[PDB]
Amino acid sequence: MVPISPIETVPVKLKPGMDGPKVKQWPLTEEKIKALVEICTEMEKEGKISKIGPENPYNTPVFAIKKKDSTKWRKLVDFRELNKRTQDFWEVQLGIPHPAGLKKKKSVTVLDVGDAYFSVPLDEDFRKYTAFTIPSINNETPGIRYQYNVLPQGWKGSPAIFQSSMTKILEPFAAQNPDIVIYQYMDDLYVGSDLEIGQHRTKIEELRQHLLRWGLTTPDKKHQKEPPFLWMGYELHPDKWTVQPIVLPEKDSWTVNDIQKLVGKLNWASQIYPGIKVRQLSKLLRGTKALTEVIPLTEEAELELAENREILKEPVHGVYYDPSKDLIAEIQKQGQGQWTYQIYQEPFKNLKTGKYARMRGAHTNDVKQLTEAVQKITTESIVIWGKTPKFKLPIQKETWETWWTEYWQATWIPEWEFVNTPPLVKLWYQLEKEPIVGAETFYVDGAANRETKLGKAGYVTNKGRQKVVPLTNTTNQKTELQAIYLALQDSGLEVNIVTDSQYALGIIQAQPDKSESELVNQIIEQLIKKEKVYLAWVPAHKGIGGNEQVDKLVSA
Amino acid sequence: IETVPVKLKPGMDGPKVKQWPLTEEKIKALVEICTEMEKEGKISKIGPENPYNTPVFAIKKKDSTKWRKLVDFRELNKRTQDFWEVQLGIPHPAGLKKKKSVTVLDVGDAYFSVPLDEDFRKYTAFTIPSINNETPGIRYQYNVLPQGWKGSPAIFQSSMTKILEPFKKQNPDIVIYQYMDDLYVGSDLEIGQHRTKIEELRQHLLRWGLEPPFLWMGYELHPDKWTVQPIVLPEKDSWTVNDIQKLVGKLNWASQIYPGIKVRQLSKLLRGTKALTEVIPLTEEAELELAENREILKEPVHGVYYDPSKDLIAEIQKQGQGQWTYQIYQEPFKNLKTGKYARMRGAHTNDVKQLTEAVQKITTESIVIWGKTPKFKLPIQKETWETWWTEYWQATWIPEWEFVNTPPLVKLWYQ
Numbered sequence: 001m002v003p004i005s006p007i008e009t010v011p012v013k014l015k016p017g018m019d020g021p022k023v024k025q026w027p028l029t030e031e032k033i034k035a036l037v038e039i040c041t042e043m044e045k046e047g048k049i050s051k052i053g054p055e056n057p058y059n060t061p062v063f064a065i066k067k068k069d070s071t072k073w074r075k076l077v078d079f080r081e082l083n084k085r086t087q088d089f090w091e092v093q094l095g096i097p098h099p100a101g102l103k104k105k106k107s108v109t110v111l112d113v114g115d116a117y118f119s120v121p122l123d124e125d126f127r128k129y130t131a132f133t134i135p136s137i138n139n140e141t142p143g144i145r146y147q148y149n150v151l152p153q154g155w156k157g158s159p160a161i162f163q164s165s166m167t168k169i170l171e172p173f174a175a176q177n178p179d180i181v182i183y184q185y186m187d188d189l190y191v192g193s194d195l196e197i198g199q200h201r202t203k204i205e206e207l208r209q210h211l212l213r214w215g216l217t218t219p220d221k222k223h224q225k226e227p228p229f230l231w232m233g234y235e236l237h238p239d240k241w242t243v244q245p246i247v248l249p250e251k252d253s254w255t256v257n258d259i260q261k262l263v264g265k266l267n268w269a270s271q272i273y274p275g276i277k278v279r280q281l282s283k284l285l286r287g288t289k290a291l292t293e294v295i296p297l298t299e300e301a302e303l304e305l306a307e308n309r310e311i312l313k314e315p316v317h318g319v320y321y322d323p324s325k326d327l328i329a330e331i332q333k334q335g336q337g338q339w340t341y342q343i344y345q346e347p348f349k350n351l352k353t354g355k356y357a358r359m360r361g362a363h364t365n366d367v368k369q370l371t372e373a374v375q376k377i378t379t380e381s382i383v384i385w386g387k388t389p390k391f392k393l394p395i396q397k398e399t400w401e402t403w404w405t406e407y408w409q410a411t412w413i414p415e416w417e418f419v420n421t422p423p424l425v426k427l428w429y430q431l432e433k434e435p436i437v438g439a440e441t442f443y444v445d446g447a448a449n450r451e452t453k454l455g456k457a458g459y460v461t462n463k464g465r466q467k468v469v470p471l472t473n474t475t476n477q478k479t480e481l482q483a484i485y486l487a488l489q490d491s492g493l494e495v496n497i498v499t500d501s502q503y504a505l506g507i508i509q510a511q512p513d514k515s516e517s518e519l520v521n522q523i524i525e526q527l528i529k530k531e532k533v534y535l536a537w538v539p540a541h542k543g544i545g546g547n548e549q550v551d552k553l554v555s556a
Numbered sequence: 557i558e559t560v561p562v563k564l565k566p567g568m569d570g571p572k573v574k575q576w577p578l579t580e581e582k583i584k585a586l587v588e589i590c591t592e593m594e595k596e597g598k599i600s601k602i603g604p605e606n607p608y609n610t611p612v613f614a615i616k617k618k619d620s621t622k623w624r625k626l627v628d629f630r631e632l633n634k635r636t637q638d639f640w641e642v643q644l645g646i647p648h649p650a651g652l653k654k655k656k657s658v659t660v661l662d663v664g665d666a667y668f669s670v671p672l673d674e675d676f677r678k679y680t681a682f683t684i685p686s687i688n689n690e691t692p693g694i695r696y697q698y699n700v701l702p703q704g705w706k707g708s709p710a711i712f713q714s715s716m717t718k719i720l721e722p723f724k725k726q727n728p729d730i731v732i733y734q735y736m737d738d739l740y741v742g743s744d745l746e747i748g749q750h751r752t753k754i755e756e757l758r759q760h761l762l763r764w765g766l767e768p769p770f771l772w773m774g775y776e777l778h779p780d781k782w783t784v785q786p787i788v789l790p791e792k793d794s795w796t797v798n799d800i801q802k803l804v805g806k807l808n809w810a811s812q813i814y815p816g817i818k819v820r821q822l823s824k825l826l827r828g829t830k831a832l833t834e835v836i837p838l839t840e841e842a843e844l845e846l847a848e849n850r851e852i853l854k855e856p857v858h859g860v861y862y863d864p865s866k867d868l869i870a871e872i873q874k875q876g877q878g879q880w881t882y883q884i885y886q887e888p889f890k891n892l893k894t895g896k897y898a899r900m901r902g903a904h905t906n907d908v909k910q911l912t913e914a915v916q917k918i919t920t921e922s923i924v925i926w927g928k929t930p931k932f933k934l935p936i937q938k939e940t941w942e943t944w945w946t947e948y949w950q951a952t953w954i955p956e957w958e959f960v961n962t963p964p965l966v967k968l969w970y971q
């Protein structure tokens with residue numbers, strides 16, 4: 001015989017304080033019992049399991065499931081209880097590669113390593129916890145007791161330990177053959193290269209021989225799976241990729257659960273189909289989660305669906321990453337807080353696409369949203385490609401300069417250039433830094449009675465203009481904004497406004513261009529019409545003339 | 557050479573913190589650093605039975621071209637036992653902050669000579685990720701005291717005292733303070749004298765070691781020249797309505813800090829509804845109130861004391877044109893230190909770089925004065941900060957921070 005290197009076992013423990021499982025074996029039919037004894041006898045000769053004595057106090061139930069449309073039963077050891085008691089492991093598969101970060105390959109070969117999986121021994125001190133019992137016929141003898149010697153299918157630790165064992169075996173081959181890539185998924189190894197077809201098969205045969213060192217045999221009759229690959233919802237080809245087909249059903253009426261998987265398909269599609277939109281369809285899921293409720297689609301959600309159908313009419317494809325070239329990211333504004341982007345290296349050949357959606361918030365503006373989309377794309381690009389793309393943004397260089405130099409927060413966006421494709425992001429208004437000479441000065445105030453919710457809002461000016469308006473079903477904060485709105489509505493193109501509302505200044509100093517509050521939107525609309533606005537703050541209740549006069553008018 | 561027993565806090569598991577995305581250049585630098593560390597026995601590969609993780613990245617220290625590995629042990633530091641066994645603590649030297657020059661030395665490399673307790677090593681696990689997750693991340697753990705873990709200076713403390721014994725005996729006026737991987741060395745000498753005693757000090761550690769990659773560098777501070785900020789009021793000959801409103805606003809704010817600030821006479825001056833730019837003559841009564849407020853503001857704030865059982869909080873305001881203001885306090889309106897910056901190097905078009913440098917300076921000042929780091933309230937969106945701060949970090953520690961999303965009106969008063 002040829003000696004084979006043993007695979008180092010991983011030490012495994014139970015969670016602190018826990019013992020192994022002691023779960024009752026379910027009673028089985030004489031028919032099922034016979035099937036299991038055959039399966040287990042063969043597994044025992046293969047070395048996978050071993051008969052044990054009666055001292056071992058642990059147990060996990062075993063079942064016999066009819067493989068559909070066959071007379072053949074198959075064994076299921078139900079490890080759910082042991083899995084609850086087993087320690088946590090490091091799981092490596094948490095991040096799956098994105099196709100747009102992969103590199104072009106001339107050849108990709110698949111090798112079956114399914115027999116490899118039980119060459120992996122189980123830590124000897126842990127095997128006792130895997131005990132299971134085949135019941136005996138008629139319960140007239142003790143059950144046949146076994147434990148595992150190898151990683152069992154269904155045990156919590158098998159994926160991580162299998163993957164880490166295979167990775168360690170493959171590391172020297174990969175390190176000493178940098179012209180190939182190796183990727184393990186389930187019971188297969190995928191081996192890619194740009195080598196000439198003969199060199200590539202030579203590397204394959206060398207990998208087969210390297211694997212033999214550990215006694216791992218690979219099927220000679222080469223794999224049925226061949227490019228393209230269906231993988232993780234994608235279709236991988238040698239030099240292109242796409243998502244698996246996106247089909248949107250025709251439906252006369254839509255349920256909550258239908259809409260959930262529509263939004264599901266559309267998000268998946270958005271990584272290569274440009275311009276996918278989901279705001280209006282996600283709106284139909286606001287709040288409620290009664291999975292069978294039918295929702296009438298708004299006229300707005302019907303339009304969005306229609307535009308999505310149009311986008312999905314034809315297949316698109318993505319290309320793979322070329323490390324020798326820069327990444328470019330281009331972003332467009334779509335409306336209602338929605339943004340779409342494309343990432344490419346040569347014009348018109350996208351590596352991938354994507355979208356970004358406004359965060360739920362009281363007030364917002366386009367520049368902040370653009371800024372957030374840029375940071376999200378930056379972060380995704382670091383993951384996929386390890387570098388920041390250069391950005392093409394629909395905002396003028398001077399608009400950006402004005403924004404970040406005056407904004408109260410620190411903010412930054414990485415190297416970028418203006419692309420002149422409407423709609424452009426712009427600043428709709430900017431407050432003055434100093435009081436305006438010759439402009440009328442409006443002292444504004446409002447107040448409300450918290451019991452009856454009656455209030456007043458108004459102003460007085462240095463020219464003797466005055467206005468007080470009675471209000472119903474209102475609050476102090478609403479009346480403070482109403483007063484500012486009245487001053488904006490009744491003034492000329494240049495106006496100084498004096499308020500004592502910290503609340504109103506908080507909003508205005510955040511420079512929204514759109515709000516959840518229709519009162520704030522009205523204020524924004526007025527601000528856009530002005531040429532100059534200076535907004536001054538004073539503390540309340542201090543004897544401040546002007547303020548002190550209209551405080552007495554509106555709080556009466 | 558023999559391990560110190562180390563445990564976590566009671567009822568407390570190891571860190572399980574996600575590795576954030578790294579650029580290609582940093583991944584490559586970390587692979588080279590770690591391959592070298594592994595051959596030197598400092599770290600070892602680990603298997604999947606270790607579920608813990610701490611983020612790692614790489615920086616370039618201030619004025620060098622060579623990459624340094626940095627491990628974000630913040631979570632591990634929170635969950636590690638406190639170290640009072642030989643010492644209740646190193647009573648923070650209050651004289652450090654009065655030297656004319658204090659130099660900061662990266663002595664972290666010395667920690668790698670002490671083995672780490674065999675039972676604690678698993679908790680130092682970290683992962684070098686791969687681009688696009690195309691290959692399994694490389695898993696390591698430390699075999700020796702890691703840089704950036706709070707236990708490293710604590711466990712190495714006995715060895716450090718002994719290495720510095722001759723230099724302390726021969727230069728007894730020098731104040732030497734250790735915080736994490738840094739050594740703060742303060743003197744009253746002239747800079748060339750100082751730089752030569754610093755180089756003297758380096759010798760003892762090359763001597764003891766027999767090579768440290770970043771021991772040669774020196775960050776020169778001058779805490780005696782540290783400027784502060786009292787509250788000052790404008791001095792004007794003509795006051796407009798706007799000027800007086802801003803004054804009353806500022807004084808109203810100051811009155812939360814200083815008991816006897818009065819605004820009633822000045823608020824009278826606003827009587828009427830005048831144009832904002834109209835000049836208002838001050839009355840005698842107003843002038844007197846203003847003068848008495850000026851006097852009050854020239855004295856220290858009452859009942860301000862540092863309490864070491866409480867966190868330090870640092871607030872920062874962007875003032876524009878590269879200028880930043882900050883306050884350090886534990887209770888509202890009881891500022892322990894205030895200051896202002898404008899010097900922000902090579903960042904004239906980068907707000908975030910400026911803020912990141914501000915954070916590091918404030919943290920350094922905090923270490924020198926109180927021996928600990930403040931919790932920052934940062935005027936920045938979380939996603940912007942988290943994406944960029946590691947690109948401008950040059951310190952070997954990392955403070956805690958939260959984010960301000962509502963514009964403070966008090967910006968106006970620190971300007």
Ligand SMILES: Cc1cc(/C=C/C#N)cc(C)c1Nc1ccnc(Nc2ccc(C#N)cc2)n1
Pocket residue numbers: 097101102103104105108181182183185190191192227228229230231236237238239690
């Ligand atoms: C992640 C991954 C999944 C599969 C396979 C998953 C499955 N099923 C196969 C391989 C080889 C890889 N790994 C890498 C690494 C770098 N570039 C590439 N490029 C690449 C991969 C497949 C095709 C094709 N056809 C073309 C190029 N693949």
Ligand SMILES: NCc1cccc(Br)c1
Pocket residue numbers: 235237240241242315316317318
């Ligand atoms: N749907 C089949 C197909 C064929 C070639 C390239 C791509 Br991407 C997709």
Ligand SMILES: [Mg+2]
Pocket residue numbers: 445446447540551555
């Ligand atoms: Mg009022």
